[PDB]
Amino acid sequence: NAMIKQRTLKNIIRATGVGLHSGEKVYLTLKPAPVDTGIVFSRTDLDPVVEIPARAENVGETTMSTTLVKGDVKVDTVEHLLSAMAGLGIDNAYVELSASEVPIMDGSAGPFVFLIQSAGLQEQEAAKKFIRIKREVSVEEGDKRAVFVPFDGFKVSFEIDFDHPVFRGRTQQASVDFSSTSFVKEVSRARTFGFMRDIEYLRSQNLALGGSVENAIVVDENRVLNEDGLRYEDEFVKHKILDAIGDLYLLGNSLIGEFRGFKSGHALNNQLLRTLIADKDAWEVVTFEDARTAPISYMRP
Ligand SMILES: C[C@@H](O)[C@H](NC(=O)c1ccc(-c2ccc(Br)cc2)cc1)C(=O)NO
Ligand SMILES: [Zn+2]
């Protein structure tokens, strides 16, 4: 039988861009890593070089993006790159950065999934480990909720709630079941977004210095300002799904289960992970010695 194997990169990937929040120019380098390394961020601009494993315990700030911290060393906005890594089944990789923030690229996981697939994937000689949800686990705060439900595969449901003319109809909720729907085709191209009133407040405080219509959907009181429009009819809720997939990948292993989110953000997503990790009776580590019988499928490398 053919086991589901761990994956890394076949070749080194190089990217350049700007941090959404910092506005700083950053050089990103993706490198192959040995079996059981996981995703590890590396700040190569520092002396000595500081390594931060992409794990729930290393999550610092969770206000507008997911930030990893080790001492006072930070790696900001890891969620879109981790979403791309999770979507393509990359287990092990070194993510080298020349600055404290992952480049925003076009605001989606699209440019990352393209850079990874261009370099190609390398299957490694070790079984891929999955975390299977055995019991329900939920976290709430006010009207926000995030839940893990046992499910034979991988499924993400998300609902947003904006009282705004652009956000009416069935476009405010989406469910993606990865047994029948491609992360690449239906999720990866969904861009980050911001409302003009919030952006004006951020700018007044010298925040979100790298943001523009080139790396985000900008919505005022009545419309989308981007001249070229949306990539999906429900691009906003698909971006929240992209975010949830990246934040969930801080578990350090692919999930076998279902995520449901209602107005959930980076903070509640990480509180859900921390609650699941603490509740050892709600999950177990599984491997698939026969890919045929597996409830999750990855694209060929
Ligand atoms: C969607 C939301 O959860 C979050 N994005 C933001 O908080 C955010 C997105 C864009 C801007 C922004 C866009 C354009 C301009 Br001009 C300035 C800021 C600010 C914050 C996000 O994608 N986190 O991963
Ligand atoms: Zn995002």
PDB file of C-alpha atoms in Angstrom, residues 7 38-39 54-56 79 81-92 128-129 148 154 243-255 273 298:
ATOM      1  CA  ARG A   7       5.811  16.790   2.236  1.00  0.00           C
ATOM      2  CA  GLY A  38       7.061  21.499  10.790  1.00  0.00           C
ATOM      3  CA  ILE A  39       6.847  25.080   9.474  1.00  0.00           C
ATOM      4  CA  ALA A  54       4.685  28.085  13.431  1.00  0.00           C
ATOM      5  CA  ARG A  55       2.845  26.626  16.467  1.00  0.00           C
ATOM      6  CA  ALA A  56      -0.129  27.818  18.569  1.00  0.00           C
ATOM      7  CA  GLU A  79      -1.949  33.450   8.183  1.00  0.00           C
ATOM      8  CA  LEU A  81       1.287  31.925   3.795  1.00  0.00           C
ATOM      9  CA  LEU A  82       0.257  29.197   6.319  1.00  0.00           C
ATOM     10  CA  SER A  83      -3.133  28.944   4.537  1.00  0.00           C
ATOM     11  CA  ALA A  84      -1.211  28.235   1.243  1.00  0.00           C
ATOM     12  CA  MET A  85       1.051  25.676   3.081  1.00  0.00           C
ATOM     13  CA  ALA A  86      -1.987  23.894   4.603  1.00  0.00           C
ATOM     14  CA  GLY A  87      -3.886  23.928   1.303  1.00  0.00           C
ATOM     15  CA  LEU A  88      -0.988  22.236  -0.527  1.00  0.00           C
ATOM     16  CA  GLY A  89      -0.171  19.815   2.334  1.00  0.00           C
ATOM     17  CA  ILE A  90       3.357  21.100   3.133  1.00  0.00           C
ATOM     18  CA  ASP A  91       4.459  19.609   6.454  1.00  0.00           C
ATOM     19  CA  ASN A  92       8.055  20.799   6.704  1.00  0.00           C
ATOM     20  CA  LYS A 128       2.075  12.328   7.463  1.00  0.00           C
ATOM     21  CA  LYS A 129       0.497  12.833  10.874  1.00  0.00           C
ATOM     22  CA  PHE A 148     -14.353  21.959  16.057  1.00  0.00           C
ATOM     23  CA  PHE A 154     -11.806  18.448   6.251  1.00  0.00           C
ATOM     24  CA  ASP A 243      -7.690  33.000   7.323  1.00  0.00           C
ATOM     25  CA  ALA A 244      -9.221  30.186   9.416  1.00  0.00           C
ATOM     26  CA  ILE A 245      -7.275  27.524   7.460  1.00  0.00           C
ATOM     27  CA  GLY A 246      -3.960  29.395   8.055  1.00  0.00           C
ATOM     28  CA  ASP A 247      -4.675  30.010  11.777  1.00  0.00           C
ATOM     29  CA  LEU A 248      -5.740  26.373  12.215  1.00  0.00           C
ATOM     30  CA  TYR A 249      -2.414  25.225  10.652  1.00  0.00           C
ATOM     31  CA  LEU A 250      -0.645  26.513  13.838  1.00  0.00           C
ATOM     32  CA  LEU A 251      -1.759  23.135  15.232  1.00  0.00           C
ATOM     33  CA  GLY A 252       1.374  21.835  13.464  1.00  0.00           C
ATOM     34  CA  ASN A 253      -0.536  19.036  11.630  1.00  0.00           C
ATOM     35  CA  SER A 254      -3.385  18.757   9.099  1.00  0.00           C
ATOM     36  CA  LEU A 255      -6.860  18.339  10.649  1.00  0.00           C
ATOM     37  CA  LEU A 273      -6.600  25.794  19.148  1.00  0.00           C
ATOM     38  CA  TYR A 298      -3.855  16.015  -1.414  1.00  0.00           C
TER      39      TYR A 298
END
